[PDB]
């Protein structure tokens, strides 16, 4: 009772009392009239630590929105974002949709509390009911959670951004502790009592919802399958009224000396200990399971090791500068150098006929063993952007329709000594797209050749290195050419495999608008990609001229997109180290090409040592 009184004082100091309960309800009341004008059919379901009243007094307001099946979740939050920004009652509106749960962050003007406006998060909403139901039935639970959470805040363990445990995980720890007690105060919703139960198929069972102080679970629209119900409270009429202080102290003991937090899983659904082997999870760090969410893993939130030992430690104790202005003559020098980069590296007719001869030889040789084959070159060779000593990409195809193919090539003596250099349809299609984009204007080919030489001199463009491929840069340069304020060329898609020049001026209204020199565009590309364009909130894509944020495709982690290959991401294997090197190279290019110098071209501007 001595310690049991101490926690109650903690509850008074940092608990959420009634006056805060209604004050937060008026938050929902004011939200109601904001979303009503544009989304009359939508409704709000209050959730989080507010209804469960397990959080602190100054806890954030967690509010969820429910919409019919016709509307899509991204469409609702986009509309909700507009409804909150144009409201004078709210400030500091932010759109952090790239988190695990897309929510809209805003601060109440009167109270100053942070409101987390989630959408379509039924898992969290139903979780609050379970937490809320237990709190009322178990008056000793609320003091335990508030005191338990308060101690973590002192140690800096409750911060999600820092890597600390999210606040909702702390509620599960307190609930599970009471269940594990040999004199349980709470019942288990899942157990061996159920007919045909077994730990092997524990994942099939799921708690649908709670109604009338009774949990409902289903095993695998109403269907005729095994179903049952379990009460939320053990029906004991003469259990000792032990002080709440003992539970708080015993909680520290169980998780510090008795319960193994490194090789066991916490689950409030069953009494038997669940090991990491059953769920096939690491034993490196703590693992916790949410009742309604049977796939919830706390390892995702807690990846760092020192923090994991820190959790066990604290519990034991309680027991781009501006650049100079450009000059006309230096702009002319930039134009000259770009044109020179086009004219030196462009394959000649003898090289194209040599490629055609190579294609014919390969076609015949493969026809010897695989008659009816049809080969077609692709890549830099025929995309309208030539390049010497470049890889020759070819697409195998058989009319009328890797290990075996390789064995055949070993037979031919020449494999290419002379030159020294399956069903890839999308590659051919984007090759034609790139050729069409190149034929529109000589500046496009000039800047693309300049980009190719720039990436070749900076030791980037290699797939094995993990950096972006040359095709990605070819798309990116077109993205810059299309994104600048004066359009130079349009997106050809707006004007197969589940994926969708003379007369262009007639249809395109802004044809010929840009009159800037080629060197000016080359420097503008660097400026745009180093100072203006943000890679963390936009996606490089030439499918349409409108913006494309990363949240829609959920590519939360440079991002470039294929014109026809939407779901495929070229920067999937892009490691942050390579991104740092890429941006360093681009900054160096801006430095060299943005500082005019009088008196002295290829050997100087594109110097590998200086640029790296």
XYZ file of C-alpha atoms in Angstrom:
612
model
C 0.000 0.000 0.000
C 2.948 2.310 0.651
C 4.152 2.093 -2.951
C 0.547 1.802 -4.125
C -0.090 5.318 -2.840
C 3.057 6.690 -4.505
C 1.914 5.733 -8.012
C -1.449 7.414 -7.414
C 0.441 10.649 -6.753
C 2.238 10.069 -10.063
C -1.171 9.633 -11.713
C -2.299 12.968 -10.268
C 0.857 14.708 -11.494
C 1.014 13.312 -15.041
C -2.263 11.459 -15.602
C -5.004 12.515 -18.005
C -7.980 13.634 -15.917
C -11.572 14.327 -16.954
C -11.071 18.034 -17.687
C -8.645 16.987 -20.425
C -11.057 14.309 -21.665
C -13.806 16.753 -22.635
C -11.291 19.382 -23.765
C -10.090 16.828 -26.316
C -13.710 16.053 -27.229
C -14.253 19.672 -28.289
C -11.286 19.099 -30.604
C -13.362 16.446 -32.364
C -16.328 18.833 -32.284
C -14.416 21.548 -34.150
C -13.000 18.973 -36.578
C -16.574 17.888 -37.292
C -17.523 21.214 -38.896
C -14.265 21.427 -40.880
C -14.584 18.088 -42.701
C -18.362 18.425 -43.139
C -18.354 20.909 -46.027
C -16.200 18.803 -48.368
C -16.629 15.261 -46.957
C -20.132 15.129 -45.443
C -20.278 11.316 -45.556
C -17.022 10.818 -43.632
C -16.830 10.300 -39.875
C -14.213 10.434 -37.120
C -13.375 7.668 -34.637
C -11.415 8.912 -31.631
C -8.600 6.579 -30.611
C -5.180 6.410 -28.998
C -4.163 7.219 -25.447
C -7.088 9.657 -25.177
C -9.914 7.116 -24.974
C -7.650 4.626 -23.193
C -6.483 7.506 -20.939
C -3.218 5.581 -20.574
C -1.022 8.468 -21.755
C 0.169 11.630 -20.071
C -1.902 14.781 -19.637
C -0.163 16.526 -22.562
C -0.371 13.539 -24.920
C -1.069 14.143 -28.597
C -4.635 13.847 -29.883
C -4.914 10.712 -32.039
C -7.945 10.975 -34.341
C -8.843 8.587 -37.168
C -11.147 9.118 -40.153
C -13.451 6.447 -41.589
C -14.705 6.610 -45.180
C -16.809 4.331 -47.402
C -15.293 1.699 -49.664
C -15.766 3.901 -52.746
C -13.119 6.434 -51.714
C -9.429 5.553 -51.495
C -7.273 6.269 -48.456
C -4.761 8.573 -50.232
C -7.625 10.637 -51.658
C -9.101 11.214 -48.190
C -5.910 12.466 -46.538
C -5.158 14.705 -49.527
C -8.612 16.269 -49.184
C -8.273 16.393 -45.390
C -4.931 18.175 -45.777
C -6.644 20.997 -47.677
C -9.420 21.223 -45.077
C -6.924 21.798 -42.249
C -4.556 24.206 -44.021
C -7.362 26.682 -44.789
C -8.578 26.691 -41.157
C -7.664 29.653 -38.958
C -8.056 27.485 -35.836
C -4.958 25.434 -36.739
C -1.301 26.206 -37.447
C 1.984 24.411 -38.141
C 0.272 22.064 -40.601
C 2.665 19.466 -42.024
C 2.277 16.466 -44.343
C 4.467 13.622 -43.055
C 2.840 10.943 -45.194
C 6.095 8.977 -45.604
C 5.883 7.477 -42.101
C 4.542 3.986 -41.439
C 1.021 5.353 -40.839
C 0.146 8.312 -43.123
C -1.114 11.080 -40.835
C -1.559 14.854 -40.982
C 0.320 16.766 -38.275
C -1.268 19.963 -36.967
C -1.278 21.911 -33.701
C -4.465 23.212 -32.104
C -4.444 27.004 -31.892
C -6.241 27.271 -28.539
C -4.895 24.302 -26.568
C -1.627 23.922 -28.490
C -1.831 20.117 -28.541
C -0.597 18.096 -31.514
C -3.327 16.307 -33.487
C -2.401 13.159 -35.442
C -5.135 12.833 -38.087
C -4.849 9.258 -39.315
C -7.129 7.765 -41.979
C -8.475 4.235 -42.347
C -6.392 2.817 -39.480
C -8.892 0.300 -38.126
C -6.142 -1.713 -36.417
C -5.247 1.125 -34.043
C -8.873 2.144 -33.466
C -9.944 -1.317 -32.297
C -6.762 -1.592 -30.220
C -7.825 1.432 -28.166
C -11.107 -0.279 -27.269
C -9.228 -3.249 -25.810
C -6.961 -0.913 -23.836
C -9.917 1.262 -22.815
C -12.019 -1.722 -21.726
C -9.249 -3.150 -19.539
C -8.612 0.189 -17.839
C -12.183 0.596 -16.610
C -12.522 -3.022 -15.480
C -9.037 -3.045 -13.929
C -8.653 0.167 -11.876
C -5.114 -0.919 -10.942
C -4.046 -1.001 -14.605
C -4.142 2.758 -15.250
C -1.750 3.635 -12.375
C 0.664 0.944 -13.576
C 0.747 2.179 -17.177
C 1.077 5.858 -16.242
C 3.878 5.132 -13.774
C 5.516 2.667 -16.172
C 5.371 5.134 -19.071
C 6.553 8.036 -16.904
C 9.700 6.158 -15.873
C 10.553 5.506 -19.526
C 10.175 9.198 -20.384
C 12.815 10.035 -17.771
C 15.261 7.619 -19.433
C 14.359 8.877 -22.947
C 12.918 5.527 -24.064
C 9.457 6.685 -25.228
C 10.619 8.615 -28.322
C 9.759 6.911 -31.649
C 11.961 9.186 -33.775
C 14.975 8.592 -31.521
C 14.505 4.838 -31.949
C 12.833 4.402 -28.582
C 9.792 2.232 -28.119
C 6.529 3.761 -29.383
C 4.139 4.698 -26.562
C 1.595 1.981 -27.388
C 4.150 -0.798 -26.828
C 4.419 0.144 -23.145
C 0.757 -0.689 -22.492
C 1.250 -4.283 -23.655
C 4.125 -4.831 -21.217
C 1.976 -3.942 -18.200
C -0.973 -6.064 -19.352
C 1.202 -9.110 -20.051
C 2.849 -8.902 -16.621
C -0.462 -9.395 -14.806
C -1.332 -12.380 -17.004
C 1.970 -14.165 -16.346
C 1.412 -13.927 -12.583
C 0.608 -17.370 -11.197
C -2.435 -15.747 -9.570
C -3.689 -14.080 -12.759
C -5.802 -10.939 -12.579
C -6.730 -11.172 -16.284
C -7.826 -14.073 -18.503
C -6.303 -15.353 -21.743
C -8.470 -14.989 -24.840
C -6.603 -17.776 -26.672
C -5.734 -21.051 -24.974
C -5.574 -24.822 -25.135
C -9.164 -24.982 -23.849
C -10.386 -24.198 -27.369
C -11.230 -27.365 -29.277
C -8.483 -28.349 -31.694
C -6.161 -25.608 -30.458
C -2.398 -25.866 -30.903
C 0.599 -23.545 -30.852
C 1.494 -24.543 -34.425
C -1.488 -22.665 -35.911
C -1.592 -19.797 -33.399
C -1.318 -17.271 -36.241
C -4.642 -18.251 -37.812
C -6.673 -17.031 -34.827
C -7.585 -13.341 -34.751
C -9.590 -11.141 -32.366
C -12.252 -9.512 -34.533
C -13.730 -7.071 -32.005
C -14.957 -6.633 -28.428
C -18.660 -6.273 -27.614
C -20.521 -6.113 -24.286
C -17.387 -6.703 -22.201
C -16.611 -9.872 -24.175
C -13.806 -10.462 -26.682
C -14.732 -12.131 -29.978
C -12.247 -14.234 -31.949
C -12.431 -16.123 -35.240
C -10.414 -18.923 -36.833
C -9.693 -19.766 -40.465
C -19.258 -11.409 -44.409
C -20.132 -14.076 -41.847
C -18.810 -17.570 -42.551
C -19.457 -20.983 -40.922
C -16.114 -21.479 -39.166
C -15.042 -22.138 -35.586
C -15.852 -19.183 -33.340
C -15.821 -18.438 -29.627
C -15.910 -15.756 -26.964
C -13.877 -15.062 -23.824
C -14.592 -12.618 -21.008
C -12.239 -9.702 -20.385
C -12.032 -10.300 -16.610
C -11.495 -13.440 -14.554
C -14.673 -14.212 -12.592
C -13.240 -14.404 -9.070
C -15.383 -13.393 -6.092
C -12.805 -13.602 -3.272
C -9.445 -12.705 -4.808
C -7.160 -10.798 -2.403
C -7.169 -7.020 -2.858
C -3.388 -6.768 -3.106
C -1.868 -3.256 -3.231
C -1.137 -1.821 -6.660
C 2.370 -0.876 -5.527
C 3.410 -4.526 -5.358
C 2.498 -5.050 -9.019
C 4.679 -2.135 -10.140
C 7.675 -3.422 -8.172
C 7.044 -7.023 -9.239
C 6.809 -5.858 -12.859
C 10.424 -4.677 -12.716
C 11.519 -7.976 -11.157
C 9.810 -10.182 -13.751
C 11.290 -8.407 -16.787
C 14.743 -7.984 -15.192
C 15.538 -11.409 -13.695
C 12.756 -13.912 -14.467
C 11.468 -13.280 -17.997
C 14.038 -13.622 -20.788
C 13.544 -10.569 -23.007
C 16.164 -11.746 -25.535
C 14.763 -15.168 -26.524
C 11.001 -14.948 -25.934
C 7.972 -13.185 -27.415
C 5.428 -11.227 -25.370
C 1.847 -12.163 -26.265
C -1.219 -11.344 -24.158
C -3.395 -13.815 -26.092
C -1.958 -17.087 -24.726
C -0.326 -18.165 -21.476
C 2.321 -20.458 -22.973
C 5.684 -18.867 -23.707
C 6.079 -18.090 -27.417
C 9.640 -18.376 -28.711
C 11.132 -16.504 -31.652
C 11.438 -19.771 -33.599
C 7.667 -20.154 -33.975
C 7.292 -16.671 -35.478
C 10.680 -16.922 -37.257
C 12.078 -13.668 -35.866
C 15.555 -12.673 -34.664
C 16.621 -13.231 -31.068
C 18.851 -10.129 -31.112
C 16.368 -7.643 -29.630
C 13.054 -7.477 -27.790
C 9.917 -8.702 -29.571
C 6.336 -7.746 -28.675
C 3.010 -8.704 -30.258
C -0.200 -6.682 -30.525
C -3.438 -8.634 -29.899
C -5.463 -7.443 -32.898
C -2.409 -7.103 -35.172
C -0.909 -10.605 -35.318
C 1.970 -9.409 -37.541
C 3.062 -6.453 -35.386
C 6.805 -6.535 -34.683
C 8.615 -4.164 -32.322
C 11.963 -5.137 -33.875
C 11.125 -2.820 -36.773
C 10.900 0.158 -34.412
C 13.847 -1.006 -32.268
C 16.799 -1.838 -34.532
C 19.673 -0.378 -32.499
C 21.429 -2.643 -29.995
C 22.602 -0.136 -27.348
C 19.012 1.048 -26.885
C 17.891 -2.550 -26.315
C 20.354 -2.999 -23.452
C 19.408 0.510 -22.315
C 15.801 -0.615 -21.816
C 16.971 -3.468 -19.591
C 19.365 -1.084 -17.824
C 16.884 1.587 -16.718
C 14.321 -1.007 -15.626
C 16.938 -2.638 -13.389
C 17.771 0.655 -11.659
C 14.120 1.262 -10.764
C 13.958 -2.241 -9.262
C 25.491 25.219 -51.459
C 26.929 28.730 -51.308
C 26.126 31.350 -53.965
C 28.203 31.282 -57.144
C 29.529 34.130 -59.320
C 27.382 35.448 -62.179
C 27.779 33.904 -65.610
C 29.462 35.770 -68.467
C 28.703 35.733 -72.217
C 32.103 34.488 -73.379
C 32.127 31.724 -70.766
C 28.633 30.748 -71.931
C 29.999 30.514 -75.477
C 32.847 28.344 -74.174
C 30.288 26.093 -72.471
C 28.342 25.792 -75.727
C 31.519 24.980 -77.663
C 32.600 22.325 -75.171
C 29.156 20.688 -75.157
C 29.062 20.546 -78.956
C 32.578 19.109 -78.890
C 31.464 16.410 -76.433
C 28.716 15.460 -78.856
C 30.993 15.380 -81.896
C 33.934 13.436 -80.426
C 32.057 10.536 -78.808
C 29.420 9.998 -81.516
C 29.818 6.581 -83.203
C 30.438 6.870 -86.936
C 28.813 4.960 -89.798
C 31.619 2.393 -89.820
C 30.796 1.679 -86.175
C 27.050 1.327 -86.819
C 27.656 -1.050 -89.732
C 30.070 -3.005 -87.527
C 27.306 -3.320 -84.912
C 24.897 -4.498 -87.617
C 27.445 -7.089 -88.757
C 27.861 -8.298 -85.165
C 24.085 -8.621 -84.844
C 23.924 -10.629 -88.074
C 26.714 -12.962 -86.939
C 25.072 -13.575 -83.564
C 21.684 -14.137 -85.209
C 23.111 -16.726 -87.602
C 25.114 -18.510 -84.903
C 22.122 -18.794 -82.571
C 19.987 -19.872 -85.540
C 22.369 -22.786 -86.125
C 21.218 -24.408 -82.865
C 17.958 -22.461 -82.314
C 16.433 -21.847 -85.756
C 13.799 -19.141 -86.016
C 15.517 -16.820 -83.539
C 15.163 -13.059 -83.989
C 17.683 -10.681 -82.416
C 17.255 -6.934 -81.954
C 19.789 -4.468 -80.581
C 18.814 -1.924 -77.937
C 20.284 0.488 -75.419
C 22.630 3.404 -76.053
C 23.320 2.106 -79.568
C 19.853 2.869 -80.964
C 18.213 5.142 -78.362
C 19.281 8.277 -80.246
C 22.164 8.813 -77.792
C 25.262 7.145 -79.204
C 28.415 6.387 -77.264
C 31.774 4.856 -78.165
C 33.119 1.785 -76.355
C 29.574 1.229 -75.065
C 27.919 -2.058 -74.165
C 25.860 -3.662 -76.942
C 22.462 -4.621 -75.516
C 20.474 -7.178 -77.521
C 17.077 -8.787 -76.930
C 16.656 -12.473 -77.763
C 13.330 -13.522 -79.279
C 12.161 -16.750 -80.939
C 9.571 -16.721 -83.713
C 6.387 -18.687 -83.117
C 6.514 -18.385 -79.319
C 20.261 -18.517 -70.136
C 22.375 -21.504 -69.120
C 21.663 -23.325 -72.388
C 22.337 -20.171 -74.414
C 25.722 -19.609 -72.758
C 26.986 -23.086 -73.665
C 26.317 -22.442 -77.360
C 28.382 -19.242 -77.387
C 31.412 -21.157 -76.093
C 31.501 -23.068 -79.386
C 32.206 -19.985 -81.512
C 35.929 -19.222 -81.490
C 35.675 -15.434 -81.729
C 33.865 -14.996 -78.402
C 34.243 -9.776 -79.107
C 37.845 -10.015 -80.299
C 37.143 -8.289 -83.622
C 35.238 -5.331 -82.152
C 36.540 -5.417 -78.575
C 33.168 -4.437 -77.093
C 15.497 -12.651 -73.340
C 12.349 -10.859 -74.553
C 13.341 -7.343 -73.475
C 10.382 -5.599 -75.082
C 10.122 -2.701 -72.619
C 13.774 -1.886 -73.304
C 13.031 -1.603 -77.027
C 9.965 0.546 -76.334
C 11.884 2.995 -74.152
C 14.679 2.975 -76.744
C 12.159 4.223 -79.300
C 10.874 6.752 -76.755
C 14.400 8.069 -76.164
C 15.055 8.259 -79.909
C 11.870 10.286 -80.401
C 12.842 12.589 -77.530
C 16.318 13.034 -79.031
C 15.119 13.840 -82.554
C 13.093 16.825 -81.300
C 16.017 19.208 -80.742
C 19.826 19.096 -81.080
C 20.187 20.554 -77.581
C 18.688 17.362 -76.133
C 21.366 15.166 -77.713
C 24.085 17.694 -76.851
C 23.180 17.720 -73.156
C 22.671 13.945 -73.072
C 26.158 13.359 -74.489
C 27.497 15.892 -71.983
C 25.786 13.995 -69.157
C 27.206 10.698 -70.425
C 30.756 12.057 -70.483
C 30.224 13.721 -67.091
C 29.153 10.440 -65.491
C 31.969 8.572 -67.255
C 34.623 10.962 -65.903
C 33.220 10.844 -62.341
C 33.409 7.031 -62.036
C 29.618 6.683 -61.766
C 27.017 4.950 -63.893
C 28.092 1.393 -63.003
C 25.461 -1.119 -61.900
C 27.891 -3.168 -59.796
C 28.991 -0.025 -57.946
C 25.360 0.431 -56.879
C 25.016 3.808 -58.602
C 22.309 4.668 -61.114
C 22.516 3.227 -64.614
C 23.075 5.327 -67.727
C 19.421 4.873 -68.714
C 18.357 6.446 -65.413
C 20.505 9.508 -66.138
C 19.077 9.636 -69.665
C 15.595 9.840 -68.151
C 16.729 12.386 -65.542
C 18.152 14.792 -68.128
C 14.832 14.653 -69.986
C 13.086 15.327 -66.674
C 15.128 18.505 -66.257
C 14.509 19.482 -69.880
C 10.763 19.126 -69.268
C 10.551 20.587 -65.745
C 12.174 24.004 -66.220
C 9.913 27.036 -66.481
C 10.304 27.453 -70.268
C 9.525 24.003 -71.699
C 12.002 22.719 -74.268
C 10.222 19.462 -75.152
C 6.910 17.979 -74.027
C 6.042 14.622 -72.508
C 5.265 12.341 -75.444
C 2.876 10.126 -73.459
C 0.317 12.865 -72.776
C 0.354 14.345 -76.289
C 2.242 -4.426 -73.684
C 3.175 -6.431 -70.577
C 0.417 -4.613 -68.707
C 1.978 -1.220 -69.474
C 0.847 1.600 -71.755
C 8.279 14.765 -84.708
C 7.457 16.970 -87.690
C 3.886 17.660 -86.531
C 4.702 18.151 -82.835
C 4.652 21.985 -83.127
C 1.070 21.823 -84.418
C -0.196 20.072 -81.280
C 2.259 21.538 -78.754
C 1.365 25.118 -77.829
C 4.685 25.993 -76.132
C 6.904 24.821 -79.011
C 10.076 26.880 -79.404
C 9.493 28.826 -76.186
C 12.983 28.360 -74.722
C 15.815 30.230 -76.463
C 18.558 29.703 -73.861
C 21.949 28.440 -75.000
C 23.055 24.844 -74.482
C 25.728 25.677 -71.907
C 23.187 27.702 -69.951
C 20.910 24.650 -69.872
C 23.824 22.432 -68.828
C 24.590 24.686 -65.856
C 20.885 25.023 -65.077
C 20.607 21.246 -64.803
C 23.275 21.226 -62.090
C 21.660 24.164 -60.294
C 18.198 22.573 -60.452
C 19.399 19.200 -59.162
C 21.686 20.662 -56.467
C 19.606 23.529 -55.022
C 16.001 23.464 -56.276
C 14.893 19.860 -56.808
C 14.453 17.815 -53.627
C 14.988 14.066 -53.973
C 13.268 13.343 -50.635
C 9.836 14.670 -51.675
C 9.637 14.261 -55.478
C 10.021 11.449 -58.014
C 11.871 11.883 -61.311
C 9.438 10.668 -63.975
C 8.647 11.749 -67.539
C 5.241 10.041 -67.712
C 3.467 13.354 -67.055
C 4.461 16.986 -66.592
C 2.747 17.278 -63.194
C 4.503 16.648 -59.894
C 4.856 13.147 -58.441
C 5.722 12.869 -54.754
C 7.291 9.734 -53.298
C 4.349 9.009 -50.980
C 1.987 7.956 -53.781
C 4.301 5.178 -54.970
C 5.471 4.646 -51.358
C 9.116 4.798 -52.497
C 10.117 6.284 -49.156
C 13.758 5.370 -49.871
C 17.602 9.432 -55.525
C 14.416 7.891 -56.942
C 13.838 7.593 -60.697
C 10.974 5.951 -62.576
C 10.660 4.204 -65.936
C 8.325 5.844 -68.497
C 6.363 2.600 -68.989
C 7.659 0.571 -66.013
C 5.814 2.297 -63.182
C 6.124 -0.209 -60.325
C 9.796 -0.831 -61.163
C 12.308 1.486 -59.473
C 15.799 1.894 -60.920
C 17.279 3.248 -57.679
C 16.074 0.291 -55.625
C 19.602 -0.803 -54.705
C 20.854 2.757 -54.234
C 22.897 2.827 -51.026
C 23.232 6.150 -49.220
C 27.018 5.979 -49.651
C 26.617 6.024 -53.436
C 24.043 8.811 -53.114
C 26.558 10.872 -51.134
C 29.205 10.278 -53.799
C 26.729 11.188 -56.561
C 25.718 14.457 -54.911
C 29.370 15.269 -54.178
C 30.198 14.762 -57.858
C 27.283 16.982 -58.891
C 28.370 19.706 -56.453
C 31.901 19.533 -57.863
C 30.506 19.808 -61.385
C 28.536 22.882 -60.350
C 31.686 24.364 -58.812
C 33.775 23.846 -61.949
C 31.079 24.918 -64.437
C 29.704 27.837 -62.401
C 32.835 29.853 -61.609
C 33.933 31.908 -64.648
C 37.682 32.021 -65.274
C 39.464 34.137 -67.891
C 42.342 32.551 -69.781
C 43.401 28.922 -70.012
C 39.089 22.742 -72.427
C 38.085 19.079 -72.161
C 41.195 18.189 -70.165
C 40.457 21.062 -67.764
C 36.680 21.025 -67.216
C 36.274 17.226 -67.142
C 39.287 16.450 -64.970
C 38.708 13.223 -62.986
C 41.076 14.281 -60.192
C 39.496 17.702 -59.634
C 35.910 16.466 -60.005
C 36.508 13.747 -57.380
